[PDB]
């Protein structure tokens, strides 16, 4: 019937760059010696992939569209149709499913047909997404105050879209709009996660104003104890940057948002969830750090292959409902030939992630412009939503006021308190998104505005 990578939708965004080459055009060199409109083989234009291009600027991986124009020939496309080979293929470590071979299933029978072949680490050469772009700095900032009110660590869930990111060939960046800070209870050095109940109704607000979870963050801030600011810097080279149950919860994580891929052979291929860590740098200044977990590493959890080791820098393989094939990791030696180690019983955990690269745009245009609601699951720092502060930020005794309704949190309360219905919400959503002045009027022209209004007057 219908493959897999026939009936999947990609995101508007795939659709773009899958029609680009991504060639880097090229002017005529010392080189060259020919007019202003002729060519050679010194001002041809590059491929995205092109390894001098990238080492020249400092781009530590490709795209993972360059990545599929390297390993794919150009004519080979989902257009063709039946004749379409998907060059695509994610990592499957696992025993295959539905053995015809004869022997029981996996847990009771195993032929070398259906077992896993070798696993071998390499420093994955793509990335699925190449850059975090925070829409404003008071995104992080608002996150923070968690921690600065506290000197606890803090989790969040980065709301926000992808789109082109054009500083690298056909570049993918992640834009976040907003930080959800789940449930969950937090130390100086550590946090637990508890049950997200409402996860499905804050997902359905960020669609109401197109957002999507585009990843994680956390924190590993200490104060230096200089009454300045400035914090300590614990991960760096000899230390870690990401530890190994750090790797194992990012690498879950993404497994639960795979991306659809009309280029592989089951119609999803990685990841776009990304994940941050706020700490401190060489500077004692807090920042960020991006990374996406490999795809073999997020298959290695998938397959229960890995789990993390006493040492944060080393993950052990699990020995022997799972099944554990050969592990080996590539290191080079010094004559510079190829070697393959034993990752068994414990590797490096360098090998199981990408880094990205963060930053603010230029003039910050973000969609939520407002502050004026406190943030979820904040009582642990006295912060708590109430129907008041609904009243408050809707400034609802005060008639002759501008509409102010350009915050996420204050969204998702509006959300929860099941008052407008999915055609209002929406209107709403599209409101504090966009801004439209004829919009906020007809919002407040709905039956359902009013009746949120009346509610807010009697408290
Ligand atoms: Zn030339
Ligand atoms: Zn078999």
């Known amino acids: 019937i219908k493959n897999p990578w026939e009936v999947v939708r990609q995101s508007p965004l795939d659709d773009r760059l899958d029609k680009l080459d991504g060639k880097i055009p090229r002017k005529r060199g010392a080189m060259c010696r020919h007019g202003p409109k002729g060519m050679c083989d010194y001002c ?90 925070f829409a404003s700095p008071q995104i992080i900032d608002r996150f923070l105050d968690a921690w600065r009110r506290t000197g606890v660590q803090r989790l969040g869930i980065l709301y926000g879209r992808y789109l082109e990111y054009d500083a690298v060939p056909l570049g993918i960046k992640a834009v976040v709009e907003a930080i959800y800070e789940p449930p969950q209870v937090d130390e100086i050095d550590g946090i637990t996660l508890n049950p997200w109940e409402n996860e499905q109704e804050v997902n359905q607000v960020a669609k109401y104003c197109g957002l999507e979870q585009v990843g994680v963050i956390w924190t590993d801030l200490l104060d230096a104890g200089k009454g300045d600011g400035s914090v300590v810097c614990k991960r760096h080279a000899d230390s870690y940057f990401l530890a190994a149950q750090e790797i194992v919860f990012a690498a879950r994580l993404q497994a639960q948002h795979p991306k659809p891929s009309k280029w ?33 590493a997020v298959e290695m959890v998938r397959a229960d292959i890995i789990e993390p080791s006493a040492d944060p820098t080393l993950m052990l393989v699990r020995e022997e409902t799972r099944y554990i094939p050969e592990v080996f990791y590539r290191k080079i030696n010094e004559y510079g030939a190829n070697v393959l180690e034993n990752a068994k019983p414990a590797f490096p955990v360098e090998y199981l992630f990408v880094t990205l690269t963060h930053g603010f745009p230029d003039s910050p245009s973000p969609l939520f412009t407002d502050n004026i609601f406190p943030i979820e699951n904040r009582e642990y720092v006295g912060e708590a939503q109430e129907v008041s502060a609904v009243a408050k930020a809707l400034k609802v005794h005060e008639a002759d006021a501008p509409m102010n309704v350009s915050d996420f949190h204050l969204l998702c309360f509006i959300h929860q308190m099941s008052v407008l219905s999915k055609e209002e919400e929406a209107l709403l959503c599209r409101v504090a998104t966009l801004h439209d002045l004829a919009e906020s009027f007809q919002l407040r022209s709905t039956t359902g505005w009013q009746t949120l209004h009346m509610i807010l007057q009697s408290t």
């Open 264 to 296: 592989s052979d089951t119609g999803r291929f990685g990841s776009n969830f990304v994940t941050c860590v706020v700490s401190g740098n060489e500077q004692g200044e807090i920042s960020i750090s991006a990374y996406q977990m490999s795809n073999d």
């Open 44 to 133: 041809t234009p590059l491929d995205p992939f092109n390894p001098q291009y990238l080492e020249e600027k400092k781009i530590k991986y490709m795209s993972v569209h360059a990545y599929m124009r390297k390993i794919n020939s150009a004519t080979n496309r989902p257009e063709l149709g039946s004749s379409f080979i998907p060059p695509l293929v994610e990592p499957y470590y696992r025993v295959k499913r539905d053995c015809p071979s004869g022997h029981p299933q996996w847990p009771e029978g195993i032929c070398t047909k259906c077992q896993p072949s070798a696993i071998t680490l390499q420093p994955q050469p793509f990335r699925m997404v190449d850059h975090v772009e």
